[PDB]
A paper describes a structure:
To preserve centromere identity, CENP-A levels must be maintained through active CENP-A loading during the cell cycle. A central player mediating this process is the Mis18 complex (Mis18α, Mis18ý and Mis18BP1), which recruits the CENP-A specific chaperone HJURP to centromeres for CENP-A deposition. The Mis18 proteins, Mis18α and Mis18ý, possess a well-conserved globular domain called the Yippee domain (also known as the MeDiY domain; spanning residues 77-180 in Mis18α and 73-176 in Mis18ý) and C-terminal α-helices (residues 196-233 in Mis18α and 191-229 in Mis18ý).
We purified Mis18α spanning aa residues 191 to 233 and Mis18ý spanning aa residues 188 and 229 ([Fig fig1]**, S1a & b**) and crystallised the reconstituted complex. The crystals diffracted X-rays to about 2.5 Å resolution. The asymmetric unit contained two copies of Mis18α/ý hetero-trimer. The two Mis18α helices interact in an antiparallel orientation, and one helix is stabilised in a slightly curved conformation. In contrast, the pI of the Mis18ý helix is 8.32. This charge complementarity appears to facilitate the interaction with Mis18α, as a positively charged surface of the Mis18ý helix snugly fits in the negatively charged groove of the Mis18α/α interface. A closer look at the intermolecular interactions reveals tight hydrophobic interactions along the ‘spine’ of the binding groove with electrostatic interactions ‘zipping-up’ both sides of the Mis18ý helix ([Fig fig1]).
Author numbering:
A (entry chain C): 190 to 222
B (entry chain A): 193 to 230
C (entry chain B): 188 to 231
The structure:
Amino acid sequence: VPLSEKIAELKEKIVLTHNRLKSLMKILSEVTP
Amino acid sequence: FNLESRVEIEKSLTQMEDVLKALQMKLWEAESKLSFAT
Amino acid sequence: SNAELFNLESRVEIEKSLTQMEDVLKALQMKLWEAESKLSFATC
């Protein structure tokens, strides 16, 4: 079941990193028209 | 994977999103292989 | 038991790509960080 927990911890990080990337994409398009 | 220019940051950030999009499918695939092996 | 064998082959190939995903993402997180510092300093 440690594999089950390694899945969940890895999922939340994909999500968090995905959110950082999203916020940076909005900041970047404010200055690249 | 360049950050010299705004145009390259843009290209590079989409590549990173495409990489995460591949990771999310790999995570799901692992979720199912595991669920099927218990 | 081919079942127990199959189970073990699964759990091996599972946690292999788990570490693989770990290595792919944390390099990704490092270049992300570089871009964050770039656009952060640039837009102050």
